[PDB]
């Protein structure tokens, strides 16, 4: 019966828990959960001691943490293998130059301005995408250029910008260690991901 | 039946939820919660739409947040009234001196050393207690003095220390606004709490 607000709130909480458990692969008996919830609220004597229940839950958390780590390590290794393959094929393509760090670049149009330094501030327009073509960032949304210091950006950009004459448009292929590396809290960027960026340097300005 | 690890984990999760809900005063029907959890995991059609359930839960969170704020404001006002009463009675007691900020103090033993300044570093031994006598902090545990800068301590201490000759032992009565004020994330110190401290200044040292 979902006639009362109490029933509807109770059903809605259960449904949210169920979705979460099913998404995480946690197998649970809803009837046994209801028994424990009822006995705890009624003030009855629980069929398990407080230590027995503390032992079951501490083990569950450890088992869950292990499975999560194993799935993150699996994805990181898959992304690394895909990246090494893409960059191994990209180096054989026309215009591709490979640098000692593993950063690769292709010149779309060369500019005639100055190449920025590490302390310098640069204004740029760019689009960042994964090897599948999924775009994750662009100034084309803002409709406005972006300003950054060459030393405060991802390593791949710091290396490329110091070789780019102002006015130039280049495409860069960044290994994961020159990007976000073995980390993926969220976003469309997962662990050990190789990235592709189209970057246009508009202007460079000194500090002092 | 709690024969399997699945049943025992399920019962243990339910018991923890029940305790939490009972401690917060949340009234829930365990059977209706089990129905929603089962239907969500089975992939069935839920008796409520996703918007209906999103409306029930958003209202619940607002109702809960309101009740929590109302109980925190109630405790803060009670603690303020108790504090004003204690300090109104303490000012009539022997040796009690009342300062313009509302800080009160009583000299147990006067020292012959120098009175510290705001930039100075001071070494002290102390015990802090509530008006009920509950001790919340002491150097008597560490078995060692504590070192602090006069400007980085609670306002009540900053005011008293600048009047205390080194070697002195004083008892101080601090209004809540010269202490932690309207805040209580945890600890034994709740909101708008007046505090009592026995403080012995051992030594004072300058900065430059
Ligand atoms: Na391309
Ligand atoms: Na006393």
């Amino acid at each position: 019966s979902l006639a009362t607000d109490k029933d509807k709130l109770s059903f809605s909480i259960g449904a949210d828990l169920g979705k979460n458990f099913k998404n995480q692969g946690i197998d649970v008996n809803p009837e046994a959960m209801a028994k424990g919830m009822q006995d705890a609220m009624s003030g009855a004597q629980l069929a398990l001691t407080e230590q027995q229940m503390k032992d079951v839950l501490n083990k569950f958390q450890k088992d869950l943490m292990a499975k999560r780590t194993a799935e993150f390590n699996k994805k990181a290794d898959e992304n690394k293998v895909k990246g090494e393959a893409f960059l191994t094929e990209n180096k054989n393509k026309p215009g591709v130059v490979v640098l000692p760090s593993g950063l690769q670049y292709k010149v779309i149009n060369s500019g005639n301005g100055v190449k920025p330094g590490k302390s310098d501030t640069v204004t740029v327009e760019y689009t960042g995408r994964l090897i599948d073509g999924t775009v994750f960032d662009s100034t084309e949304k803002t409709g406005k250029p972006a300003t950054f210091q060459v030393s405060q950006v991802i390593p791949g950009w710091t290396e490329a910008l110091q070789l780019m004459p102002a006015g130039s448009t280049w495409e860069i292929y960044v290994p994961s260690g020159l990007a976000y590396g073995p980390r993926s809290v969220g976003g469309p960027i997962g662990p050990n991901e190789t990235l592709i960026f189209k970057i246009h340097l508009i202007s460079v300005k000194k500090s002092s």
Side-chain angles (χ1 to χ4, degrees), chain A residues 10-23:
Chain A
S10 293
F11 173 100
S12 289
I13 291 156
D16 183 80
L17 289 152
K19 172 144 72 167
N20 188 221
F21 284 134
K22 192 59 170 174
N23 295 333

Side-chain angles (χ1 to χ4, degrees), chain A residues 54-67:
Chain A
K54 186 190 80 88
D55 280 341
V56 160
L57 291 173
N58 286 331
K59 158 163 198 144
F60 167 82
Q61 287 292 312
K62 276 163 178 155
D63 294 357
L64 211 69
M65 276 339 292
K67 285 162 158 150

Side-chain angles (χ1 to χ4, degrees), chain A residues 78-94:
Chain A
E78 280 172 4
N79 290 333
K80 183 137 293 302
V81 170
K82 289 154 179 237
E84 311 230 84
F86 164 85
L87 291 167
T88 286
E89 201 202 323
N90 195 57
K91 55 143 167 75
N92 309 290
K93 308 216 191 174

Side-chain angles (χ1 to χ4, degrees), chain A:
Chain A
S1 166
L2 297 193
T4 76
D5 294 342
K6 181 178 176 173
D7 295 324
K8 285 176 196 183
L9 163 64
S10 293
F11 173 100
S12 289
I13 291 156
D16 183 80
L17 289 152
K19 172 144 72 167
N20 188 221
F21 284 134
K22 192 59 170 174
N23 295 333
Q24 288 182 101
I26 297 145
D27 191 10
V28 162
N29 173 24
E31 213 79 9
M33 190 184 274
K35 172 67 163 155
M37 189 178 302
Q38 189 80 88
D39 296 330
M41 303 197 75
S42 77
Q45 260 279 298
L46 306 183
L48 289 163
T49 64
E50 271 289 354
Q51 189 62 39
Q52 273 182 293
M53 288 186 286
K54 186 190 80 88
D55 280 341
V56 160
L57 291 173
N58 286 331
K59 158 163 198 144
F60 167 82
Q61 287 292 312
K62 276 163 178 155
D63 294 357
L64 211 69
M65 276 339 292
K67 285 162 158 150
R68 275 182 247 226
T69 291
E71 244 56 52
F72 179 85
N73 297 331
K74 173 150 183 289
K75 182 49 162 164
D77 179 64
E78 280 172 4
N79 290 333
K80 183 137 293 302
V81 170
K82 289 154 179 237
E84 311 230 84
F86 164 85
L87 291 167
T88 286
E89 201 202 323
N90 195 57
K91 55 143 167 75
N92 309 290
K93 308 216 191 174
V96 176
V97 166
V98 180
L99 302 169
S101 66
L103 195 88
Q104 305 181 355
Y105 70 88
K106 180 179 159 239
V107 182
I108 316 314
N109 179 78
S110 188
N112 56 58
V114 301
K115 294 188 183 170
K118 302 213 233 280
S119 40
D120 295 346
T121 282
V122 292
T123 304
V124 305
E125 284 168 8
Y126 66 93
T127 309
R129 68 181 195 275
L130 301 167
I131 294 155
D132 66 356
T134 289
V135 172
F136 59 78
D137 203 13
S138 192
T139 50
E140 85 202 339
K141 284 196 78 180
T142 316
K144 281 237 184 244
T147 311
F148 312 89
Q149 210 195 330
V150 163
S151 55
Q152 304 307 113
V153 290
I154 60 160
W157 279 42
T158 306
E159 310 234 341
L161 282 156
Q162 289 180 71
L163 320 172
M164 266 181 94
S168 301
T169 290
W170 287 19
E171 175 149 294
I172 60 153
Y173 317 88
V174 188
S176 73
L178 301 183
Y180 301 114
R183 93 191 172 180
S184 163
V185 183
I189 299 185
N192 291 347
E193 198 102 64
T194 278
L195 308 186
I196 304 142
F197 292 89
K198 177 137 164 255
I199 293 156
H200 173 36
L201 173 59
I202 290 120
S203 60
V204 338
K205 60 207 281 170
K206 299 275 138 183
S207 57
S208 325

